[PDB]
């Protein structure tokens, strides 16, 4: 061949923390189909927003929006348990089909994105230029979102374990753990990676008895 149809930019969705998760990498030959299984951010979440993104930036907000759509009808469950399979399918004609299927409730929602949607030849080079220009800033943002999701996981898992524990946990441990969770919740609102890790460290220093009980 003298020619290849390829994707000039990454295609993916927004995940928790406002990060782009890539489903189809830059410079992929079409046609192509990739899928990844995602889950819910919160307990008893009834729906997901699929925000489709084109670009090379880690921040969802810094990429081109191709559209969004909801999948409703998710049955009550702990966060992280529902299986929401997302499929990006680019046909020979260069049309992007995005689907989200609930593997429990079997429900499906799709968006179809014409071959002409997204960033023009110029904007593509400006986007590729920015990726490499703001690469350090995108790393820093990425490990703040990682830190934030670890702290949020520790917050939620610890509250769960305080409850399962009931009377098994000394009053002294519970006061100390309760104060640390409040302090961690507050810091998770902020932007300060160091302050999140400090509250995560406080909770881990005071939680040793609770961790034994969770056994």
């Amino acid at each position: 061949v003298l020619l290849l149809d390829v994707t000039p930019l990454s295609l993916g969705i927004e995940t928790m923390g406002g990060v782009m998760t890539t489903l189809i990498a830059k410079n992929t030959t079409i046609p192509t189909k990739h899928s990844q299984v995602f889950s819910t951010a919160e307990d008893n979440q009834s729906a997901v927003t699929i925000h489709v993104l084109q670009g090379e930036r880690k921040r969802a907000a810094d990429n081109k929006s191709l559209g969004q759509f909801n999948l409703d009808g998710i049955n009550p469950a702990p966060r992280g348990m529902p299986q929401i399979e997302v499929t990006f399918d680019i046909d020979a004609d260069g049309i992007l089909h995005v689907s989200a299927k609930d593997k429990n409730s079997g429900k499906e929602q799709k968006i179809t994105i014409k071959a002409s949607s997204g960033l023009n030849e110029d904007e593509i080079q400006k986007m590729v230029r920015d990726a490499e220009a703001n690469a350090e800033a995108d790393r820093k943002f990425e490990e703040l979102v990682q830190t934030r999701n670890q702290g949020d996981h520790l917050l939620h898992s610890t509250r769960k374990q305080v409850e399962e524990a009931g009377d098994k946990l000394p009053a002294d441990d519970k006061t100390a753990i309760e104060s640390a969770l409040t302090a961690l919740e507050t810091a998770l609102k902020g932007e300060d990676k160091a302050a999140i890790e400090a509250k995560m460290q406080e909770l881990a220093q005071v939680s040793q008895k609770l961790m034994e009980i969770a056994q």
Binding site: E14, T15, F38, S39, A41, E42, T49
Partner: peptide, 4 residues
């Protein structure tokens, strides 16, 4: 791997 989570969506809001």
């Amino acid at each position: 791997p989570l969506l809001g």
